[PDB]
Amino acid sequence: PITLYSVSDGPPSLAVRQALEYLGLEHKLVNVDFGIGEHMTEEFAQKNPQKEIPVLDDNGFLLGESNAILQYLAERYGKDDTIYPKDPMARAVVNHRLCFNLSTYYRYISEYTLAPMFFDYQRTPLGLKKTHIALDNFNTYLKLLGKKYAAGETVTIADFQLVTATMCLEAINFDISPWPLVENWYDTYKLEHPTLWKIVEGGMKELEAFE
Amino acid sequence: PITLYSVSDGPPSLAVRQALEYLGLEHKLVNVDFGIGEHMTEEFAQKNPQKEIPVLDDNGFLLGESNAILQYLAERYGKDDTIYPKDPMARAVVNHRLCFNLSTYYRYISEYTLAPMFFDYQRTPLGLKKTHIALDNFNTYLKLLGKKYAAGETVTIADFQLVTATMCLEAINFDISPWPLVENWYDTYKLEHPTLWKIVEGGMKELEAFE
Ligand SMILES: N[C@@H](CCC(=O)N[C@@H](CS)C(=O)NCC(=O)O)C(=O)O
Ligand SMILES: N[C@@H](CCC(=O)N[C@@H](CS)C(=O)NCC(=O)O)C(=O)O
């Protein structure tokens, strides 16, 4: 079987869960922030030095880092390659956007939105400026590629990540209308993939309560 | 033709250059920190909103993010898949280590070593602790996988990145002997891939001068 160790309102976990839903993959979900889930990772803590969540357990194969989990699930499962194309150039655009999310978009958004929620970290003007730069960059990338989704004309695993990062801004009532291509993309995602957005919305609601 | 826009002593650039050498790919190298290189990216600055370096220009296809550049070069070129295996599980270990480098290993090392060199950023005990955690994690990953290299028994594109991150510690005379598996891996890399280490060493020497 497949088991996902996850944080119920963690954007990386929510990215992986959208992929599992899109691919129709049965799995056990362990929310490590829910009740006894805290201890349900003890069976493999020496194996994740980073205290790594999410972690995917595919029939004994343990894999961390949400980007790598998504790249693995999409290559190994599914009837076609549309969410992670095999063509090297098409794939490179997906891989680029996944790197952009990890290094820049979700890096700066998460530091401004979530870190102050759950830590003694402070929101600052500099953190706000970096959030604006990340949104500028994403708006420009959408304009440059010229397609409906972040790495193609249809959804890919890059969108699964970028959506959960953008949701962090919504969770704190951050107005994204200054980035019209990002706003249009986000609304289009929700309209065309309601069962995927539904997963992310459940996490958003938890975050709004503890904003 | 292929053109690489690079920073002569930038670890991400040096990772890509090792791949170009390993794959035997002829290319034009533009060091944007050398003389007139500063302006030689003006022909595509609207196209890289992040002020993105390195950037690969493969016959008109422009690709940023060093991880994505490496994943593209290794899939598109080369006679075998040993530096980026096609098998989904073997590939997932490479992808995981690339994510680990971006999110954690090079993230914390670069903030402790290089950012204070070239900015008003300060070395702190917390930054040192995070460097130690990153090295702990890498030592544990090498032990867990149990292989000679970071994602297999032979070199992969993950090693090209992890080597340039570790070089930043060497550039400031940081002793890595408390992490014996990392030290052994680093020395083995240099012994078995001298033409690749040579590229990285040239950048190290520039960084040592301005440490
Ligand atoms: N780079 C990792 C980040 C995962 C992550 O940050 N997980 C959080 C929960 S949202 C955690 O539990 N620990 C890491 C932290 O301190 O942020 C990924 O994409 O999977
Ligand atoms: N995530 C990017 C990082 C590239 C990067 O940081 N490049 C540096 C030179 S080493 C730069 O020129 N600008 C970004 C910065 O401010 O660090 C990658 O892996 O390619």
Residue numbers in the entry:
A (entry chain A), B (entry chain A): 2 to 212
The authors write:
Glutathione S-transferases (GSTs) constitute a large superfamily of multifunctional enzymes that are ubiquitously present in both prokaryotes and eukaryotes. In general, GSTs catalyze the conjugation of the reduced glutathione (GSH)—a nucleophilic tripeptide comprised of three amino acids: cysteine, glutamic acid, and glycine—to a wide range of substrates that have an electrophilic carbon, nitrogen, or sulfur atom. In the current study, we identified an unclassified GST gene, LdGSTu1 from the Colorado potato beetle (CPB, Leptinotarsa decemlineata [Say]) in Coleoptera, which represents the most species-rich eukaryotic order, containing about half of the described herbivorous insect species (>400,000). The enzyme kinetic parameters and enzyme-substrate interaction studies demonstrated that LdGSTu1 could catalyze the conjugation of GSH to both CDNB and PNA, with a higher turnover number for CDNB than PNA.
